[PDB]
Structures are given as C-alpha cells and as structure tokens.
Amino acid sequence: TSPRLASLFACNRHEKFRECVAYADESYAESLEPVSRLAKLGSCTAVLYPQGDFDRLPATIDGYMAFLFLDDLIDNSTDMSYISEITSRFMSTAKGTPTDDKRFFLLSRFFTDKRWDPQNLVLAIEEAQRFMDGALALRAIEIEERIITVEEYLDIRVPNTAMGFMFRVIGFAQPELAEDLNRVMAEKPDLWDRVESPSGKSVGIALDLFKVVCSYTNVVKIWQRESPVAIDLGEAIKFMVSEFYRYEKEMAEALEELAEFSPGLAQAVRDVQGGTLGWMNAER
Ligand SMILES: CC(C)=CCC/C(C)=C/CC/C(C)=C/CO
C-alpha cells in the first residue's frame, strides 16, 4: 500500500559514499547504540550532499543520526510534558550548552563544530526551533483530536519535515555555498520561501504516505475528512500522490529563479530533494 514516488530531481551520489557508510557504522556503534536503521543514514547523507566536501560529511552524519534518534523519542511520545522536555533539551544542546548525555552528545558535536559559517549556524538553529515547534503543535493536535484542514496541516508540517533544515546544512556540507545561502536569506527571502515551501509540502506528503495509526496528523487521513465526497484510504492516497507531483512541479519552477541567483545552490537543493526521495523509495 502507498506507491513509489518518481521525483523530478535526480538522486546523485557522493564519490566517497562507501566511506560515508563505514563511518556511519563505526560512529553509531560507539556513540549511540548504548542508548539498526540509524547507521543507514550513512548512505543517506552521501546522496543528500553529492557535491559536498567529504571532510564535512562525517560531522553531518553524526548530526543527522542524533537528530533522527531524538525525533524518534518525540514522535513516539504520548504526552506534551515529555515532548517539551526533549525538545527544549534539543535546542539548548543546539545552542552549545555542554552535555555528557549520550542522548545529546552527537547532536552537540554537530552544532558546536567549529567549521560552521557563523550565519549558517544561526540559520540552522532557528530552523531546528521551527521543526520543534512544529512537532509540539502536531502532538497537541493529535492529543486534542482537533480536526484541521489539509492547508492548516501542511503549513505546520513544512518545518517539521526537516527539508528546510537540510537545506540550511547545505552551507555546512558544501561550504562554497555558505555565502550564497546567507545572501539569499538576507536579500531574497521570498524567492527562498517559494522553493522551500513546496519542498516541505511535497516531502511532508511523501512522509505521511510512506507510513500507511496517526489519525489527526497524517495528511491522508486529514484529506479523508476534508473531502467533499466520501473517500477511502486508497482514494485519499491517490489524490495526495497527485498533490506530491504538483508541489514538485511548483518547486522546480521556483528553482529556475533561484538558479539564476545561484546555480550552485539551486543544484544543491535539487540534490537534497532528489536524494531524499531516492532514499525513501530505495528503503521501499
Ligand atoms: C528525515 C527525512 C526528512 C527523511 C528521511 C531520511 C533523512 C533525510 C534523514 C536525515 C535528515 C534528518 C535531519 C532527519 C530528521 O528528521
């Protein structure tokens, strides 16, 4: 149930992907297993930053494993009090508060990595906060059993897909693009949002499709209630699949304007989106 999605964007692989896999394995064993899928974010960073600087990718691998680990505790949490404690610990860790807690150690290493461009780091922290606020809002909706529209959902969901976060990390993984990333955010935020918004919407749809019991915070179930005519799960999937292709077309059009501002940054965003989708499909 729920089909492969054919991204408009190529899935390209860093030359040193086999180094990425073996690093992901060793580092997971050492710093995370004491508290599986997580190491397979080795192969994944390799297809997110194919024109990245290999020397930046082990740090990125560690950051993403730690992020995936903690988000698993958040998404798998019943009550707001627990989720609030983890999210606030996440953000104080992203902001450099020291910790000797293996739930947070790899996260800390990534966010305190001295090679960050300083304004890229601030961008990354601010977007991580948007991700966390997104997760808190969605949990509260599921607990309240609040019926919201698809449109309300997707606007909340976009930061919580981590697409915008992975786009900010482009500046760390591919440091030749750090300056263009800062520039576009300071000078053309509207154009930037025309790219990132359909990206988060398409990938949020893809994510929700790929986990077909989360009834008020899955866009498939949400559209089931919103729909003007009764639809079953299979018909709701069909439509949201149609929506995924529509948002990707909107994103690609927006990337043509970004590309005249920065061809390099526009290509790196394409590669993040196409590697994300390539990997989700490949983990069939
Ligand atoms: C998590 C997403 C958007 C896709 C699955 C594979 C992936 C890109 C993992 C690493 C990125 C990350 C920061 C995950 C936090 O959700």
PDB file of C-alpha atoms and ligand atoms in Angstrom:
ATOM      1  CA  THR A   1       0.000   0.000   0.000  1.00  0.00           C
ATOM      2  CA  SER A   2       1.213   3.544  -0.912  1.00  0.00           C
ATOM      3  CA  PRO A   3       3.363   3.788  -4.054  1.00  0.00           C
ATOM      4  CA  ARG A   4       6.842   4.742  -5.141  1.00  0.00           C
ATOM      5  CA  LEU A   5       7.128   8.431  -5.996  1.00  0.00           C
ATOM      6  CA  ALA A   6       9.129   9.465  -9.080  1.00  0.00           C
ATOM      7  CA  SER A   7      10.874  12.668  -8.066  1.00  0.00           C
ATOM      8  CA  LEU A   8      11.579  15.250 -10.736  1.00  0.00           C
ATOM      9  CA  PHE A   9      15.047  15.532  -9.186  1.00  0.00           C
ATOM     10  CA  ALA A  10      17.906  13.148  -9.804  1.00  0.00           C
ATOM     11  CA  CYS A  11      19.308  11.099  -6.947  1.00  0.00           C
ATOM     12  CA  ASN A  12      23.096  11.618  -7.168  1.00  0.00           C
ATOM     13  CA  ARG A  13      25.789  10.011  -5.006  1.00  0.00           C
ATOM     14  CA  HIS A  14      28.925  11.450  -3.430  1.00  0.00           C
ATOM     15  CA  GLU A  15      32.114   9.903  -4.804  1.00  0.00           C
ATOM     16  CA  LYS A  16      33.005   8.647  -1.306  1.00  0.00           C
ATOM     17  CA  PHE A  17      29.697   7.055  -0.380  1.00  0.00           C
ATOM     18  CA  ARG A  18      31.409   3.897   0.830  1.00  0.00           C
ATOM     19  CA  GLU A  19      33.455   5.977   3.251  1.00  0.00           C
ATOM     20  CA  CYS A  20      30.166   7.510   4.395  1.00  0.00           C
ATOM     21  CA  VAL A  21      28.655   4.084   5.121  1.00  0.00           C
ATOM     22  CA  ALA A  22      31.577   2.748   7.138  1.00  0.00           C
ATOM     23  CA  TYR A  23      31.822   5.937   9.141  1.00  0.00           C
ATOM     24  CA  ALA A  24      28.091   5.804   9.929  1.00  0.00           C
ATOM     25  CA  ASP A  25      28.546   2.205  11.180  1.00  0.00           C
ATOM     26  CA  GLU A  26      31.516   2.865  13.486  1.00  0.00           C
ATOM     27  CA  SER A  27      30.176   6.115  14.913  1.00  0.00           C
ATOM     28  CA  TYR A  28      26.731   4.645  15.598  1.00  0.00           C
ATOM     29  CA  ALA A  29      28.332   1.694  17.416  1.00  0.00           C
ATOM     30  CA  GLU A  30      30.443   3.991  19.602  1.00  0.00           C
ATOM     31  CA  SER A  31      28.266   6.956  20.495  1.00  0.00           C
ATOM     32  CA  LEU A  32      24.608   5.913  20.081  1.00  0.00           C
ATOM     33  CA  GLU A  33      23.966   2.149  20.340  1.00  0.00           C
ATOM     34  CA  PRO A  34      24.356   2.360  24.169  1.00  0.00           C
ATOM     35  CA  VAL A  35      21.025   4.208  24.300  1.00  0.00           C
ATOM     36  CA  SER A  36      19.909  -0.720  13.013  1.00  0.00           C
ATOM     37  CA  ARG A  37      18.184   1.899  10.860  1.00  0.00           C
ATOM     38  CA  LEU A  38      20.192   4.809  12.292  1.00  0.00           C
ATOM     39  CA  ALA A  39      23.517   3.865  10.716  1.00  0.00           C
ATOM     40  CA  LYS A  40      21.841   3.653   7.320  1.00  0.00           C
ATOM     41  CA  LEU A  41      21.853   7.468   7.450  1.00  0.00           C
ATOM     42  CA  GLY A  42      25.383   6.884   6.197  1.00  0.00           C
ATOM     43  CA  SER A  43      24.320   6.066   2.677  1.00  0.00           C
ATOM     44  CA  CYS A  44      21.739   8.836   3.011  1.00  0.00           C
ATOM     45  CA  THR A  45      23.982  11.850   3.699  1.00  0.00           C
ATOM     46  CA  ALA A  46      26.032  10.697   0.723  1.00  0.00           C
ATOM     47  CA  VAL A  47      23.034  11.261  -1.604  1.00  0.00           C
ATOM     48  CA  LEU A  48      21.896  14.493   0.116  1.00  0.00           C
ATOM     49  CA  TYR A  49      25.223  16.330  -0.447  1.00  0.00           C
ATOM     50  CA  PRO A  50      26.734  14.698  -3.553  1.00  0.00           C
ATOM     51  CA  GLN A  51      28.756  17.821  -4.371  1.00  0.00           C
ATOM     52  CA  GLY A  52      29.567  18.240  -0.675  1.00  0.00           C
ATOM     53  CA  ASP A  53      33.032  18.352   0.866  1.00  0.00           C
ATOM     54  CA  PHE A  54      33.695  14.824   2.064  1.00  0.00           C
ATOM     55  CA  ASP A  55      35.521  16.222   5.122  1.00  0.00           C
ATOM     56  CA  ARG A  56      32.211  17.726   6.314  1.00  0.00           C
ATOM     57  CA  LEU A  57      30.128  14.578   5.887  1.00  0.00           C
ATOM     58  CA  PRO A  58      31.100  12.547   8.982  1.00  0.00           C
ATOM     59  CA  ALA A  59      30.096  15.512  11.154  1.00  0.00           C
ATOM     60  CA  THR A  60      26.842  15.773   9.196  1.00  0.00           C
ATOM     61  CA  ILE A  61      26.245  12.019   9.516  1.00  0.00           C
ATOM     62  CA  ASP A  62      26.603  12.257  13.281  1.00  0.00           C
ATOM     63  CA  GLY A  63      24.274  15.240  13.491  1.00  0.00           C
ATOM     64  CA  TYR A  64      21.592  13.530  11.434  1.00  0.00           C
ATOM     65  CA  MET A  65      21.733  10.266  13.370  1.00  0.00           C
ATOM     66  CA  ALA A  66      21.377  12.206  16.627  1.00  0.00           C
ATOM     67  CA  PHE A  67      18.532  14.232  15.136  1.00  0.00           C
ATOM     68  CA  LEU A  68      16.793  11.096  13.885  1.00  0.00           C
ATOM     69  CA  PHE A  69      17.305   9.421  17.266  1.00  0.00           C
ATOM     70  CA  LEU A  70      15.775  12.243  19.301  1.00  0.00           C
ATOM     71  CA  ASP A  71      12.900  12.811  16.866  1.00  0.00           C
ATOM     72  CA  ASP A  72      12.044   9.100  17.309  1.00  0.00           C
ATOM     73  CA  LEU A  73      11.564   9.825  21.036  1.00  0.00           C
ATOM     74  CA  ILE A  74       9.406  12.864  20.201  1.00  0.00           C
ATOM     75  CA  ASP A  75       7.215  11.236  17.508  1.00  0.00           C
ATOM     76  CA  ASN A  76       6.909   8.229  19.854  1.00  0.00           C
ATOM     77  CA  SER A  77       5.655  10.150  22.846  1.00  0.00           C
ATOM     78  CA  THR A  78       2.145  10.298  24.245  1.00  0.00           C
ATOM     79  CA  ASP A  79       2.088  13.435  26.328  1.00  0.00           C
ATOM     80  CA  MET A  80       3.158  17.029  25.935  1.00  0.00           C
ATOM     81  CA  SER A  81       5.255  17.113  29.142  1.00  0.00           C
ATOM     82  CA  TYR A  82       7.817  14.571  27.897  1.00  0.00           C
ATOM     83  CA  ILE A  83       7.975  16.031  24.358  1.00  0.00           C
ATOM     84  CA  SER A  84       8.534  19.523  25.785  1.00  0.00           C
ATOM     85  CA  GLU A  85      11.481  18.332  27.874  1.00  0.00           C
ATOM     86  CA  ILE A  86      13.176  16.584  24.939  1.00  0.00           C
ATOM     87  CA  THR A  87      12.612  19.480  22.530  1.00  0.00           C
ATOM     88  CA  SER A  88      13.935  22.063  24.958  1.00  0.00           C
ATOM     89  CA  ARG A  89      16.971  19.862  25.695  1.00  0.00           C
ATOM     90  CA  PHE A  90      17.455  19.546  21.942  1.00  0.00           C
ATOM     91  CA  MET A  91      17.502  23.323  21.477  1.00  0.00           C
ATOM     92  CA  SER A  92      19.808  24.067  24.446  1.00  0.00           C
ATOM     93  CA  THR A  93      22.112  21.411  23.010  1.00  0.00           C
ATOM     94  CA  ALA A  94      21.931  23.039  19.557  1.00  0.00           C
ATOM     95  CA  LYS A  95      22.836  26.326  21.277  1.00  0.00           C
ATOM     96  CA  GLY A  96      26.068  24.959  22.752  1.00  0.00           C
ATOM     97  CA  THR A  97      25.051  24.028  26.267  1.00  0.00           C
ATOM     98  CA  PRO A  98      27.544  21.246  27.187  1.00  0.00           C
ATOM     99  CA  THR A  99      26.305  17.753  27.890  1.00  0.00           C
ATOM    100  CA  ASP A 100      27.735  14.355  28.851  1.00  0.00           C
ATOM    101  CA  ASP A 101      24.433  12.671  27.980  1.00  0.00           C
ATOM    102  CA  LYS A 102      24.655  10.225  25.092  1.00  0.00           C
ATOM    103  CA  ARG A 103      21.092  11.101  24.074  1.00  0.00           C
ATOM    104  CA  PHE A 104      22.605  14.507  23.069  1.00  0.00           C
ATOM    105  CA  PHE A 105      26.353  14.050  22.614  1.00  0.00           C
ATOM    106  CA  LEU A 106      26.403  13.593  18.844  1.00  0.00           C
ATOM    107  CA  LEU A 107      23.884  16.419  18.440  1.00  0.00           C
ATOM    108  CA  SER A 108      26.238  18.657  20.441  1.00  0.00           C
ATOM    109  CA  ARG A 109      29.253  17.674  18.339  1.00  0.00           C
ATOM    110  CA  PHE A 110      27.456  18.667  15.120  1.00  0.00           C
ATOM    111  CA  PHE A 111      26.122  22.024  16.367  1.00  0.00           C
ATOM    112  CA  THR A 112      29.411  23.012  18.038  1.00  0.00           C
ATOM    113  CA  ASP A 113      31.532  22.055  15.009  1.00  0.00           C
ATOM    114  CA  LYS A 114      33.944  24.925  14.679  1.00  0.00           C
ATOM    115  CA  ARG A 115      33.781  24.930  10.852  1.00  0.00           C
ATOM    116  CA  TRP A 116      30.215  26.238  10.559  1.00  0.00           C
ATOM    117  CA  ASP A 117      29.846  29.517   8.790  1.00  0.00           C
ATOM    118  CA  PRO A 118      28.516  31.601  11.684  1.00  0.00           C
ATOM    119  CA  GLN A 119      25.368  32.939   9.997  1.00  0.00           C
ATOM    120  CA  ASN A 120      24.618  29.464   8.564  1.00  0.00           C
ATOM    121  CA  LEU A 121      24.706  28.099  12.143  1.00  0.00           C
ATOM    122  CA  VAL A 122      22.273  30.727  13.339  1.00  0.00           C
ATOM    123  CA  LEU A 123      20.048  29.819  10.378  1.00  0.00           C
ATOM    124  CA  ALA A 124      20.273  26.143  11.318  1.00  0.00           C
ATOM    125  CA  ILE A 125      19.407  26.733  14.995  1.00  0.00           C
ATOM    126  CA  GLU A 126      16.459  28.942  14.058  1.00  0.00           C
ATOM    127  CA  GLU A 127      15.131  26.300  11.681  1.00  0.00           C
ATOM    128  CA  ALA A 128      15.598  23.494  14.204  1.00  0.00           C
ATOM    129  CA  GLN A 129      13.426  25.545  16.518  1.00  0.00           C
ATOM    130  CA  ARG A 130      10.772  25.725  13.771  1.00  0.00           C
ATOM    131  CA  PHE A 131      10.949  21.932  13.462  1.00  0.00           C
ATOM    132  CA  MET A 132      10.465  21.509  17.220  1.00  0.00           C
ATOM    133  CA  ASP A 133       7.580  23.987  17.410  1.00  0.00           C
ATOM    134  CA  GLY A 134       6.072  22.061  14.534  1.00  0.00           C
ATOM    135  CA  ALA A 135       6.359  18.761  16.360  1.00  0.00           C
ATOM    136  CA  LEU A 136       4.837  20.239  19.537  1.00  0.00           C
ATOM    137  CA  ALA A 137       1.891  21.715  17.623  1.00  0.00           C
ATOM    138  CA  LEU A 138       1.230  18.435  15.818  1.00  0.00           C
ATOM    139  CA  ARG A 139       1.369  16.365  19.007  1.00  0.00           C
ATOM    140  CA  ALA A 140      -1.090  18.733  20.691  1.00  0.00           C
ATOM    141  CA  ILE A 141      -3.462  18.353  17.715  1.00  0.00           C
ATOM    142  CA  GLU A 142      -3.307  14.549  17.971  1.00  0.00           C
ATOM    143  CA  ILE A 143      -3.975  14.689  21.727  1.00  0.00           C
ATOM    144  CA  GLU A 144      -6.846  17.135  21.305  1.00  0.00           C
ATOM    145  CA  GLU A 145      -8.163  15.132  18.324  1.00  0.00           C
ATOM    146  CA  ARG A 146      -8.572  18.502  16.571  1.00  0.00           C
ATOM    147  CA  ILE A 147      -9.881  18.348  13.014  1.00  0.00           C
ATOM    148  CA  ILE A 148      -7.840  20.735  10.894  1.00  0.00           C
ATOM    149  CA  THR A 149      -7.681  21.205   7.153  1.00  0.00           C
ATOM    150  CA  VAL A 150      -5.022  19.905   4.786  1.00  0.00           C
ATOM    151  CA  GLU A 151      -3.930  23.515   4.274  1.00  0.00           C
ATOM    152  CA  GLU A 152      -3.567  24.199   8.009  1.00  0.00           C
ATOM    153  CA  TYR A 153      -1.725  20.884   8.411  1.00  0.00           C
ATOM    154  CA  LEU A 154       0.794  21.439   5.678  1.00  0.00           C
ATOM    155  CA  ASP A 155       1.683  24.950   6.835  1.00  0.00           C
ATOM    156  CA  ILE A 156       2.501  23.498  10.292  1.00  0.00           C
ATOM    157  CA  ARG A 157       4.174  20.420   8.837  1.00  0.00           C
ATOM    158  CA  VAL A 158       6.604  22.110   6.433  1.00  0.00           C
ATOM    159  CA  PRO A 159       9.376  22.877   9.027  1.00  0.00           C
ATOM    160  CA  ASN A 160       8.787  19.561  10.726  1.00  0.00           C
ATOM    161  CA  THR A 161       9.744  17.704   7.536  1.00  0.00           C
ATOM    162  CA  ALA A 162      13.373  18.924   8.192  1.00  0.00           C
ATOM    163  CA  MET A 163      13.723  19.835   4.485  1.00  0.00           C
ATOM    164  CA  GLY A 164      14.454  23.461   5.355  1.00  0.00           C
ATOM    165  CA  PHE A 165      16.944  22.274   7.971  1.00  0.00           C
ATOM    166  CA  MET A 166      18.696  20.040   5.460  1.00  0.00           C
ATOM    167  CA  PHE A 167      18.760  22.973   3.025  1.00  0.00           C
ATOM    168  CA  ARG A 168      20.458  25.191   5.659  1.00  0.00           C
ATOM    169  CA  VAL A 169      23.002  22.352   6.250  1.00  0.00           C
ATOM    170  CA  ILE A 170      23.982  22.675   2.595  1.00  0.00           C
ATOM    171  CA  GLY A 171      26.136  25.577   3.755  1.00  0.00           C
ATOM    172  CA  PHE A 172      27.969  23.327   6.180  1.00  0.00           C
ATOM    173  CA  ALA A 173      28.364  20.263   3.938  1.00  0.00           C
ATOM    174  CA  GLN A 174      29.272  22.276   0.800  1.00  0.00           C
ATOM    175  CA  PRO A 175      30.953  25.333   2.282  1.00  0.00           C
ATOM    176  CA  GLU A 176      31.480  27.004  -1.109  1.00  0.00           C
ATOM    177  CA  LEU A 177      27.727  27.760  -0.908  1.00  0.00           C
ATOM    178  CA  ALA A 178      27.645  29.215   2.604  1.00  0.00           C
ATOM    179  CA  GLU A 179      27.816  32.801   1.347  1.00  0.00           C
ATOM    180  CA  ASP A 180      25.105  32.336  -1.286  1.00  0.00           C
ATOM    181  CA  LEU A 181      22.886  30.741   1.357  1.00  0.00           C
ATOM    182  CA  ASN A 182      23.322  33.736   3.664  1.00  0.00           C
ATOM    183  CA  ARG A 183      22.757  36.144   0.786  1.00  0.00           C
ATOM    184  CA  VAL A 184      19.563  34.566  -0.426  1.00  0.00           C
ATOM    185  CA  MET A 185      18.080  34.557   3.068  1.00  0.00           C
ATOM    186  CA  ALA A 186      19.026  38.191   3.665  1.00  0.00           C
ATOM    187  CA  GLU A 187      18.211  39.548   0.194  1.00  0.00           C
ATOM    188  CA  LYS A 188      15.601  37.304  -1.418  1.00  0.00           C
ATOM    189  CA  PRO A 189      13.698  35.544   1.396  1.00  0.00           C
ATOM    190  CA  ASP A 190      10.539  35.467  -0.689  1.00  0.00           C
ATOM    191  CA  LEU A 191      12.198  33.547  -3.502  1.00  0.00           C
ATOM    192  CA  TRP A 192      13.756  31.272  -0.915  1.00  0.00           C
ATOM    193  CA  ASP A 193      10.359  30.531   0.526  1.00  0.00           C
ATOM    194  CA  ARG A 194       8.920  29.817  -2.949  1.00  0.00           C
ATOM    195  CA  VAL A 195      11.422  26.962  -3.142  1.00  0.00           C
ATOM    196  CA  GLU A 196      11.284  25.625   0.396  1.00  0.00           C
ATOM    197  CA  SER A 197       7.513  25.763   0.882  1.00  0.00           C
ATOM    198  CA  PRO A 198       6.565  23.323  -1.967  1.00  0.00           C
ATOM    199  CA  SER A 199       9.573  21.245  -0.964  1.00  0.00           C
ATOM    200  CA  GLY A 200       8.294  20.751   2.581  1.00  0.00           C
ATOM    201  CA  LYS A 201       4.739  20.193   1.333  1.00  0.00           C
ATOM    202  CA  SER A 202       5.787  17.521  -1.191  1.00  0.00           C
ATOM    203  CA  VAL A 203       8.092  15.778   1.232  1.00  0.00           C
ATOM    204  CA  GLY A 204       5.545  16.024   4.069  1.00  0.00           C
ATOM    205  CA  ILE A 205       3.059  14.305   1.777  1.00  0.00           C
ATOM    206  CA  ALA A 206       5.676  11.735   0.857  1.00  0.00           C
ATOM    207  CA  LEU A 207       6.477  11.081   4.526  1.00  0.00           C
ATOM    208  CA  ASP A 208       2.835  10.677   5.520  1.00  0.00           C
ATOM    209  CA  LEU A 209       2.199   8.438   2.517  1.00  0.00           C
ATOM    210  CA  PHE A 210       5.143   6.246   3.423  1.00  0.00           C
ATOM    211  CA  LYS A 211       3.817   5.402   6.892  1.00  0.00           C
ATOM    212  CA  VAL A 212       0.455   3.995   5.821  1.00  0.00           C
ATOM    213  CA  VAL A 213      -2.327   4.755  13.173  1.00  0.00           C
ATOM    214  CA  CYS A 214      -1.937   8.623  13.382  1.00  0.00           C
ATOM    215  CA  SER A 215      -5.372   9.918  12.593  1.00  0.00           C
ATOM    216  CA  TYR A 216      -5.404  13.729  13.033  1.00  0.00           C
ATOM    217  CA  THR A 217      -1.819  14.500  11.888  1.00  0.00           C
ATOM    218  CA  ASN A 218      -1.454  12.423   8.704  1.00  0.00           C
ATOM    219  CA  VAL A 219      -2.411  14.333   5.575  1.00  0.00           C
ATOM    220  CA  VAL A 220      -4.039  11.238   4.048  1.00  0.00           C
ATOM    221  CA  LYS A 221      -6.466  10.876   6.960  1.00  0.00           C
ATOM    222  CA  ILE A 222      -6.897  14.648   7.127  1.00  0.00           C
ATOM    223  CA  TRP A 223      -7.959  14.862   3.485  1.00  0.00           C
ATOM    224  CA  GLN A 224     -10.299  11.959   4.129  1.00  0.00           C
ATOM    225  CA  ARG A 225     -12.279  14.194   6.493  1.00  0.00           C
ATOM    226  CA  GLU A 226     -11.959  17.354   4.481  1.00  0.00           C
ATOM    227  CA  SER A 227     -13.028  15.783   1.209  1.00  0.00           C
ATOM    228  CA  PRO A 228     -16.401  16.971  -0.163  1.00  0.00           C
ATOM    229  CA  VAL A 229     -17.313  13.345  -1.065  1.00  0.00           C
ATOM    230  CA  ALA A 230     -16.597  10.173   0.869  1.00  0.00           C
ATOM    231  CA  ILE A 231     -13.192   8.679   0.009  1.00  0.00           C
ATOM    232  CA  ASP A 232     -11.457   5.590   1.371  1.00  0.00           C
ATOM    233  CA  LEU A 233      -7.771   5.387   2.269  1.00  0.00           C
ATOM    234  CA  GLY A 234      -6.816   4.178  -1.208  1.00  0.00           C
ATOM    235  CA  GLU A 235      -8.559   7.081  -2.926  1.00  0.00           C
ATOM    236  CA  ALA A 236      -7.101   9.586  -0.440  1.00  0.00           C
ATOM    237  CA  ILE A 237      -3.612   8.229  -1.225  1.00  0.00           C
ATOM    238  CA  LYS A 238      -4.248   8.554  -4.979  1.00  0.00           C
ATOM    239  CA  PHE A 239      -5.092  12.236  -4.559  1.00  0.00           C
ATOM    240  CA  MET A 240      -2.214  13.090  -2.242  1.00  0.00           C
ATOM    241  CA  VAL A 241       0.146  11.352  -4.675  1.00  0.00           C
ATOM    242  CA  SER A 242      -1.268  13.743  -7.287  1.00  0.00           C
ATOM    243  CA  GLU A 243      -0.514  16.555  -4.862  1.00  0.00           C
ATOM    244  CA  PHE A 244       3.090  15.386  -4.426  1.00  0.00           C
ATOM    245  CA  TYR A 245       3.740  15.697  -8.168  1.00  0.00           C
ATOM    246  CA  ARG A 246       2.032  19.104  -8.240  1.00  0.00           C
ATOM    247  CA  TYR A 247       4.197  20.562  -5.462  1.00  0.00           C
ATOM    248  CA  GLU A 248       7.390  19.208  -7.011  1.00  0.00           C
ATOM    249  CA  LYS A 249       6.471  20.960 -10.306  1.00  0.00           C
ATOM    250  CA  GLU A 250       5.918  24.188  -8.319  1.00  0.00           C
ATOM    251  CA  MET A 251       9.271  23.712  -6.590  1.00  0.00           C
ATOM    252  CA  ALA A 252      11.107  23.095  -9.868  1.00  0.00           C
ATOM    253  CA  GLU A 253       9.691  26.305 -11.326  1.00  0.00           C
ATOM    254  CA  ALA A 254      10.864  28.223  -8.238  1.00  0.00           C
ATOM    255  CA  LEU A 255      14.314  26.640  -8.510  1.00  0.00           C
ATOM    256  CA  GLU A 256      14.702  28.113 -12.002  1.00  0.00           C
ATOM    257  CA  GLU A 257      14.577  31.592 -10.472  1.00  0.00           C
ATOM    258  CA  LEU A 258      16.963  30.544  -7.657  1.00  0.00           C
ATOM    259  CA  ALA A 259      19.345  29.120 -10.235  1.00  0.00           C
ATOM    260  CA  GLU A 260      19.875  32.482 -11.885  1.00  0.00           C
ATOM    261  CA  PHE A 261      20.722  33.852  -8.391  1.00  0.00           C
ATOM    262  CA  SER A 262      22.958  30.844  -7.542  1.00  0.00           C
ATOM    263  CA  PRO A 263      23.204  27.863  -9.922  1.00  0.00           C
ATOM    264  CA  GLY A 264      25.306  26.038  -7.329  1.00  0.00           C
ATOM    265  CA  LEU A 265      22.821  26.484  -4.506  1.00  0.00           C
ATOM    266  CA  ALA A 266      19.899  25.612  -6.757  1.00  0.00           C
ATOM    267  CA  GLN A 267      21.615  22.395  -7.829  1.00  0.00           C
ATOM    268  CA  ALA A 268      22.411  21.504  -4.202  1.00  0.00           C
ATOM    269  CA  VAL A 269      18.746  21.966  -3.245  1.00  0.00           C
ATOM    270  CA  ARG A 270      17.719  19.750  -6.193  1.00  0.00           C
ATOM    271  CA  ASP A 271      20.179  17.125  -4.942  1.00  0.00           C
ATOM    272  CA  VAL A 272      18.840  17.255  -1.371  1.00  0.00           C
ATOM    273  CA  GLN A 273      15.250  16.794  -2.627  1.00  0.00           C
ATOM    274  CA  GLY A 274      16.148  14.079  -5.157  1.00  0.00           C
ATOM    275  CA  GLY A 275      18.352  12.212  -2.683  1.00  0.00           C
ATOM    276  CA  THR A 276      15.640  12.415  -0.009  1.00  0.00           C
ATOM    277  CA  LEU A 277      13.081  10.897  -2.411  1.00  0.00           C
ATOM    278  CA  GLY A 278      15.551   8.451  -3.924  1.00  0.00           C
ATOM    279  CA  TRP A 279      16.363   7.123  -0.473  1.00  0.00           C
ATOM    280  CA  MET A 280      12.749   6.836   0.702  1.00  0.00           C
ATOM    281  CA  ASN A 281      11.873   4.851  -2.445  1.00  0.00           C
ATOM    282  CA  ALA A 282      15.007   2.713  -2.069  1.00  0.00           C
ATOM    283  CA  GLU A 283      14.012   1.867   1.513  1.00  0.00           C
ATOM    284  CA  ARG A 284      10.908   0.595  -0.322  1.00  0.00           C
TER     285      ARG A 284
HETATM  286  C1  LIG B   1      14.090  12.771   7.928  1.00  0.00           C
HETATM  287  C2  LIG B   1      13.802  12.942   6.454  1.00  0.00           C
HETATM  288  C3  LIG B   1      13.337  14.301   6.049  1.00  0.00           C
HETATM  289  C4  LIG B   1      13.952  11.960   5.575  1.00  0.00           C
HETATM  290  C5  LIG B   1      14.432  10.562   5.825  1.00  0.00           C
HETATM  291  C6  LIG B   1      15.924  10.457   5.558  1.00  0.00           C
HETATM  292  C7  LIG B   1      16.698  11.651   6.050  1.00  0.00           C
HETATM  293  C8  LIG B   1      16.787  12.788   5.076  1.00  0.00           C
HETATM  294  C9  LIG B   1      17.302  11.649   7.236  1.00  0.00           C
HETATM  295  C10 LIG B   1      18.255  12.654   7.800  1.00  0.00           C
HETATM  296  C11 LIG B   1      17.750  14.049   7.957  1.00  0.00           C
HETATM  297  C12 LIG B   1      17.245  14.455   9.310  1.00  0.00           C
HETATM  298  C13 LIG B   1      17.808  15.735   9.832  1.00  0.00           C
HETATM  299  C14 LIG B   1      16.241  13.821   9.889  1.00  0.00           C
HETATM  300  C15 LIG B   1      15.419  14.400  10.952  1.00  0.00           C
HETATM  301  O1  LIG B   1      14.055  14.087  10.658  1.00  0.00           O
END
